[PDB]
PDB file of C-alpha atoms in Angstrom:
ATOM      1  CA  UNK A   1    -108.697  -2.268 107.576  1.00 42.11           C
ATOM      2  CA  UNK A   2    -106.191  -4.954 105.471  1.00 39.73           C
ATOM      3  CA  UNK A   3    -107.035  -7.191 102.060  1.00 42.04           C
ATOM      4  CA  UNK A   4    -109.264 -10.257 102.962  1.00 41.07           C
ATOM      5  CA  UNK A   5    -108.329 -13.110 100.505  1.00 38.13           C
ATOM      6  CA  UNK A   6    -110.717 -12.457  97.591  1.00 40.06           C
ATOM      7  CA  UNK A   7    -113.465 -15.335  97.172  1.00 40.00           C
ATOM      8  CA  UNK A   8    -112.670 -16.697 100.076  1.00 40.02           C
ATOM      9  CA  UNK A   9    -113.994 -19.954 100.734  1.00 39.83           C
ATOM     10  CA  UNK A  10    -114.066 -21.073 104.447  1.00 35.73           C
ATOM     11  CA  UNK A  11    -115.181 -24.724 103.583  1.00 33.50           C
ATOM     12  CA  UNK A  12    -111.583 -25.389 101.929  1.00 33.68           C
ATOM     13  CA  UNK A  13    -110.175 -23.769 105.032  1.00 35.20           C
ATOM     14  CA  UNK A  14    -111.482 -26.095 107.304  1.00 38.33           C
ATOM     15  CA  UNK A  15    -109.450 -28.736 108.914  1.00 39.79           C
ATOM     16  CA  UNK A  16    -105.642 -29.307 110.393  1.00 39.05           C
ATOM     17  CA  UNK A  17    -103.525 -26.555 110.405  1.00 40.16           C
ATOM     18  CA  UNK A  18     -99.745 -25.424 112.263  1.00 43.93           C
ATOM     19  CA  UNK A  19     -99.239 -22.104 113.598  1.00 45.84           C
ATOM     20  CA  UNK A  20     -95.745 -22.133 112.156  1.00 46.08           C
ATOM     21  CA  UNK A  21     -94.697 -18.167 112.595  1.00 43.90           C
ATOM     22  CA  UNK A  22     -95.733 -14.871 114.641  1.00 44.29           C
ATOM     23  CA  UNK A  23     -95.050 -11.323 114.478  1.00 47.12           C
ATOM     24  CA  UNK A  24     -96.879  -9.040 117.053  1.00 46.62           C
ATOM     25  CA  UNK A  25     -95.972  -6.041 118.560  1.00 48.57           C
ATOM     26  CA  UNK A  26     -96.223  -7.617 122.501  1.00 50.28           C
ATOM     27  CA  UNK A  27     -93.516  -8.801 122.967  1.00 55.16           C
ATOM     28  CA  UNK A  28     -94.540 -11.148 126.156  1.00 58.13           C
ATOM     29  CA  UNK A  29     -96.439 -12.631 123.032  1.00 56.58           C
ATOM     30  CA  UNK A  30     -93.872 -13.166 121.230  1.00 58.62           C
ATOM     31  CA  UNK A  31     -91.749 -14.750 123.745  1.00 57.92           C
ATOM     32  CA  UNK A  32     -94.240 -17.126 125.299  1.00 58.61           C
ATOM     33  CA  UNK A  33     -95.242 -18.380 121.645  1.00 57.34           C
ATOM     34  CA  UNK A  34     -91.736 -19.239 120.909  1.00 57.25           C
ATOM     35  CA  UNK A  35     -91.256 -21.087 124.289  1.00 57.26           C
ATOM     36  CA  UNK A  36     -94.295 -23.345 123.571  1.00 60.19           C
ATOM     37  CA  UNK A  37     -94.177 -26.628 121.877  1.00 63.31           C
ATOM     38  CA  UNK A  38     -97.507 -26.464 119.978  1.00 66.48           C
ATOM     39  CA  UNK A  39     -99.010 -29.082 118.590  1.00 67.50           C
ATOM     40  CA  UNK A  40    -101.971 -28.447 116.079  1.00 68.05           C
ATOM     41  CA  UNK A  41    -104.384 -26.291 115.109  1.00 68.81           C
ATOM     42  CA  UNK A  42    -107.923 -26.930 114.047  1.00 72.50           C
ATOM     43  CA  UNK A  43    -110.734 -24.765 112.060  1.00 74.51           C
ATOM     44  CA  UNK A  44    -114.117 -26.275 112.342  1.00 74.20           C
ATOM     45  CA  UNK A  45    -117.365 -24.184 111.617  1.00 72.66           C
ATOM     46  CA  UNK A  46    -118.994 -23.035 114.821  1.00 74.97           C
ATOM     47  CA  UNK A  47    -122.981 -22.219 114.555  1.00 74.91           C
ATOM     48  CA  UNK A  48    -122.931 -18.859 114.245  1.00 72.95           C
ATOM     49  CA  UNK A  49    -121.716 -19.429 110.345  1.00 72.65           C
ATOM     50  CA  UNK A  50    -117.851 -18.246 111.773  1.00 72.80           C
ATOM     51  CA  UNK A  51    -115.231 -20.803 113.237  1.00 74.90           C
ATOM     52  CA  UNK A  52    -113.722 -22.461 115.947  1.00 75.04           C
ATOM     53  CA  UNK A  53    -110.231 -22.440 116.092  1.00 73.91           C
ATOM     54  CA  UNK A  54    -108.914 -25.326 118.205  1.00 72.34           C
ATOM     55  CA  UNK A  55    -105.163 -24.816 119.437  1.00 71.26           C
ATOM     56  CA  UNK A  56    -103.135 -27.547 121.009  1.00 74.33           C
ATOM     57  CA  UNK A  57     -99.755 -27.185 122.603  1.00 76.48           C
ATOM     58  CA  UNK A  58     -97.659 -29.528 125.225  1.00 74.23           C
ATOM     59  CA  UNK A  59     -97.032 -28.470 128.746  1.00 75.24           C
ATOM     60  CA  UNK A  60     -95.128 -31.113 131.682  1.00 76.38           C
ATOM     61  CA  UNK A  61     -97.046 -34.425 130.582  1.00 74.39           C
ATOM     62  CA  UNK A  62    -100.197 -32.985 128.984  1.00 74.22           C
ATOM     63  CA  UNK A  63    -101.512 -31.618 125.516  1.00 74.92           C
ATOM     64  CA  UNK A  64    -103.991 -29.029 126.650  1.00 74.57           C
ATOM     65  CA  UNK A  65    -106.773 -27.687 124.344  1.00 75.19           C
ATOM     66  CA  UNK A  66    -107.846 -24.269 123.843  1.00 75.42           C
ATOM     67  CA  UNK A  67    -110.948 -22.563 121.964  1.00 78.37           C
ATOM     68  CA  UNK A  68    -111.090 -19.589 119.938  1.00 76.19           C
ATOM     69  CA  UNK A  69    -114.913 -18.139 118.127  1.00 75.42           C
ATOM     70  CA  UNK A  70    -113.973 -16.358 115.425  1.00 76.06           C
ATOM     71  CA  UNK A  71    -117.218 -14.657 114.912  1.00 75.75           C
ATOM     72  CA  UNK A  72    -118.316 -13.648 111.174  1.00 72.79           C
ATOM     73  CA  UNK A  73    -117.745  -9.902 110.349  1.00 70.60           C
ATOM     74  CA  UNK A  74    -119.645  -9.317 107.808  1.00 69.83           C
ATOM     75  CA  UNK A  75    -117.037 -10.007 104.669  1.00 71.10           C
ATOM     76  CA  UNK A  76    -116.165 -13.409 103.945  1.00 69.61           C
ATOM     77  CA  UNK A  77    -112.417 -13.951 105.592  1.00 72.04           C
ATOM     78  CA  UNK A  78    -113.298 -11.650 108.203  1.00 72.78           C
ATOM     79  CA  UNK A  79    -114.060 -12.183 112.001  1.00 75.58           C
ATOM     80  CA  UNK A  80    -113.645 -10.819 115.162  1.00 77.67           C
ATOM     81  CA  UNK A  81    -112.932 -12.409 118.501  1.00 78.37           C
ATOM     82  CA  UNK A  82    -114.406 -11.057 121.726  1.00 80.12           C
ATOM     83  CA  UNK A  83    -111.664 -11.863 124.847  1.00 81.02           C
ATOM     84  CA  UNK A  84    -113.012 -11.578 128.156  1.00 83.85           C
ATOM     85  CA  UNK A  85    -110.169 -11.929 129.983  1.00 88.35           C
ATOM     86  CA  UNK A  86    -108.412  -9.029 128.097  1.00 86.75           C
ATOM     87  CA  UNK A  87    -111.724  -6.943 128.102  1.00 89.62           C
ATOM     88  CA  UNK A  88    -111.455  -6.347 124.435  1.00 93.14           C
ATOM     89  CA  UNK A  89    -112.590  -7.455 120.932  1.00 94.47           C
ATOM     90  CA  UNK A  90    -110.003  -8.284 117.802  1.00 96.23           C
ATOM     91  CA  UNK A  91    -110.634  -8.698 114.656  1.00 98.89           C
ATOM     92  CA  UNK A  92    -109.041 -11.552 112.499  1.00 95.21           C
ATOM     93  CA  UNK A  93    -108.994 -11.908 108.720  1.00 98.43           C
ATOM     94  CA  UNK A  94    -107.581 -14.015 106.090  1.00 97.48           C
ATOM     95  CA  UNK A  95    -105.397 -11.976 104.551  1.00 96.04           C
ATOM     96  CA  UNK A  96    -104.173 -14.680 102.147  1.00 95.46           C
ATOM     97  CA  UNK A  97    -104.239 -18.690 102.049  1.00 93.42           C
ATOM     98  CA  UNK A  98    -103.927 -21.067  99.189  1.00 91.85           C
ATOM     99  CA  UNK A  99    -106.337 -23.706 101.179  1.00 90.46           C
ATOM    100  CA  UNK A 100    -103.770 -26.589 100.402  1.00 88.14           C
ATOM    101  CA  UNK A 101    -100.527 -24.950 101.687  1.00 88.98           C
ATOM    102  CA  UNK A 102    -100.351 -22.444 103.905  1.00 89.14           C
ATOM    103  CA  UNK A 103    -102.894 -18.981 104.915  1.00 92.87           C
ATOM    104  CA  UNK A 104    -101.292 -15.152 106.508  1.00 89.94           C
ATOM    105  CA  UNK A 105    -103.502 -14.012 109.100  1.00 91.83           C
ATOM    106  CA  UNK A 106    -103.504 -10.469 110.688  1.00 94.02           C
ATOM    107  CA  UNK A 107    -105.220  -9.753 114.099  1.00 92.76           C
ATOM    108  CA  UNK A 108    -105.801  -6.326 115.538  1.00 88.64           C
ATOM    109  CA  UNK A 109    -107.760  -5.063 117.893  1.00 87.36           C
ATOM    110  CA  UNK A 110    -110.821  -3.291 118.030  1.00 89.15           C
ATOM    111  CA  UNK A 111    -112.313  -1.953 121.470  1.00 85.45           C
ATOM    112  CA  UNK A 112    -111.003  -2.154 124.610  1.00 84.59           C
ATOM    113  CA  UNK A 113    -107.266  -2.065 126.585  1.00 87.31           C
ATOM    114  CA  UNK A 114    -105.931  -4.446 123.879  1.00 87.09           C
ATOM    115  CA  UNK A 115    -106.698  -2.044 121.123  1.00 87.35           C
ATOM    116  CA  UNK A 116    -103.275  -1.236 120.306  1.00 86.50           C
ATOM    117  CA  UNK A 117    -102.794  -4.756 119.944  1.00 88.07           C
ATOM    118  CA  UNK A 118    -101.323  -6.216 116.208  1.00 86.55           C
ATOM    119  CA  UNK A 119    -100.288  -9.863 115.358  1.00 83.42           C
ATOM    120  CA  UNK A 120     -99.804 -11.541 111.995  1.00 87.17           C
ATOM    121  CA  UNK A 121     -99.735 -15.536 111.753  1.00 89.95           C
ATOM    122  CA  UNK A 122     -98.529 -18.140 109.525  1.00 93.68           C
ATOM    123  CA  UNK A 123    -100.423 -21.244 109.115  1.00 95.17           C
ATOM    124  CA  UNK A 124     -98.702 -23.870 107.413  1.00 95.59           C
ATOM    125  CA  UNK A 125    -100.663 -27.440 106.023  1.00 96.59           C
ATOM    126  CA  UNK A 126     -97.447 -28.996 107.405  1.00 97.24           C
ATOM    127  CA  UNK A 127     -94.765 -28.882 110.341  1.00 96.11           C
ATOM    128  CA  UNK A 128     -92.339 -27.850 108.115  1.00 92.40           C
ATOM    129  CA  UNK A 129     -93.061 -24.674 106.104  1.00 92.76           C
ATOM    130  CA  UNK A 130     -90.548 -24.364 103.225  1.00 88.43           C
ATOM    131  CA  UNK A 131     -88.270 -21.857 102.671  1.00 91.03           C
ATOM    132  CA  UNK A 132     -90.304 -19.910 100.743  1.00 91.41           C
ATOM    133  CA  UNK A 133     -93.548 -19.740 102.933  1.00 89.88           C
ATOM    134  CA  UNK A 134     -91.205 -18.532 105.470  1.00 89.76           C
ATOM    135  CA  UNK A 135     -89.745 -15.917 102.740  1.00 89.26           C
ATOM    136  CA  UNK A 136     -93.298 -14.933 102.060  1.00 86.63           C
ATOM    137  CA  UNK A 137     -94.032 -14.773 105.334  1.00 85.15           C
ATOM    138  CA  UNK A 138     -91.284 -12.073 106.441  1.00 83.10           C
ATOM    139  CA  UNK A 139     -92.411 -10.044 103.726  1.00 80.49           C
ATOM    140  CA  UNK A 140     -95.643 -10.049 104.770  1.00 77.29           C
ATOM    141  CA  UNK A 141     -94.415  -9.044 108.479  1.00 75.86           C
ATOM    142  CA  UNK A 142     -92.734  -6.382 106.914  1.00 77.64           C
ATOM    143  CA  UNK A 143     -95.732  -5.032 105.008  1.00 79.13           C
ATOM    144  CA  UNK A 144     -97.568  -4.906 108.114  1.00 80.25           C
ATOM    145  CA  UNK A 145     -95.192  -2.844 109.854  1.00 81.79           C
ATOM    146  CA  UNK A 146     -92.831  -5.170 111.923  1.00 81.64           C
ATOM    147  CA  UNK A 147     -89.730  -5.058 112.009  1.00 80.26           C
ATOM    148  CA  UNK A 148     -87.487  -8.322 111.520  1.00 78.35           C
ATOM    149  CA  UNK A 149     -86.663  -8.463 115.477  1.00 78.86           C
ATOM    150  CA  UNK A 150     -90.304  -8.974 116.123  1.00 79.69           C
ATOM    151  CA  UNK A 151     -90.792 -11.664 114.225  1.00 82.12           C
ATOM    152  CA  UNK A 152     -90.686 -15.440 115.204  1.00 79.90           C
ATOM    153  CA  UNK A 153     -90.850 -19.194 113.588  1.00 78.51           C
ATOM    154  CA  UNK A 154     -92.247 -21.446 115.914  1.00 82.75           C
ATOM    155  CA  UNK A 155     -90.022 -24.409 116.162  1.00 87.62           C
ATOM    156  CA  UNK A 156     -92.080 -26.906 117.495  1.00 88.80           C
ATOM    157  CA  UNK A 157     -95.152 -25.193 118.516  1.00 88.32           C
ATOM    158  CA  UNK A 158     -95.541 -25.009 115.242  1.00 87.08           C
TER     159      UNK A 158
END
């Protein structure tokens, strides 16, 4: 499919992350990302040797919480997520990630409607990427086929 960070090691991937940028090809995606004020992210091992990726964003008075399985695919860096509201299955890898600084995902789907479906994410250690974790992340947009218009920092979801 796409690279998987070589060696990856999902113990040093564990812990508080910011979804800092998005580029996906839906664009009510896109648009409802960049209206959100999101808070963090956390990874956390689930039992089935994958993760659990814990999303937080604001909405009126309330921080609401939100669960993702990211079940192992058989590589290390590699997962896939079953949605049952959408009917369909994505998979997820680490493309890249330094641990300490900042990881590129790319999601895509695999069966069902959502299929068609692409998204790549930036996950930043902080709430402010630097300028050049945002350069690298444009470039990796770009490598995945999107063009600059679909491609969004998150504020302050972020």
């Amino acid at each position: 499919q796409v690279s998987v960070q070589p060696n990856f090691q999902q113990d040093k991937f564990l812990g508080r992350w910011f979804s800092a940028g998005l580029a996906s090809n839906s664009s009510w995606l896109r648009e409802k990302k960049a209206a959100l004020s999101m808070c963090k992210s956390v990874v956390a091992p689930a039992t089935d040797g994958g993760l659990n990726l814990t999303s937080t964003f604001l909405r009126k008075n309330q921080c609401e919480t939100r669960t993702m399985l990211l079940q192992p695919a058989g590589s290390l860096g590699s997962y896939s997520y079953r949605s049952p509201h959408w009917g369909s299955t994505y998979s997820v890898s680490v493309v890249e990630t330094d641990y300490d600084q900042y990881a590129l995902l790319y999601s895509q789907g695999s069966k069902g409607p959502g299929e068609d479906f692409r998204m790549a994410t930036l996950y930043s250690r902080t709430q402010t990427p630097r300028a050049e974790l945002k350069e690298k992340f444009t470039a990796f947009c770009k490598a995945q086929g999107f063009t600059e218009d679909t491609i969004v920092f998150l504020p302050q979801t972020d």
